[PDB]
Amino acid sequence: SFLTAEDCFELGKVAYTEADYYHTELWMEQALRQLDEGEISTIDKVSVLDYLSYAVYQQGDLDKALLLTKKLLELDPEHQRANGNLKYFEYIMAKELEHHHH
């Protein structure tokens, strides 16, 4: 008995709903790793990255959260929340660089 990429994503959603943001990351990244090894599956990466980027933000990994938000926005440029997240991160980053210029 074993876990498909779909299973891993579902387990990631269980972790997320209990605010286990590290386990969210572990399961979601495992879902992506199974896809990348050529597992055939029907889950969408956009939804995976939506959970993953938020979970990584919860861990205080702002750079990696930004990375993941940009990967999401490459696949779904429409995505409303990722667009809002991007604006937030760019705001924070613009603030940091404003500080170093003063």
Binding site: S47, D50, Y51, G84, Y88
Partner: peptide
């Protein structure tokens, strides 16, 4: 502030 899935 950032917004995750509901």
């Amino acid at each position: 502030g950032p917004a995750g899935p509901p």
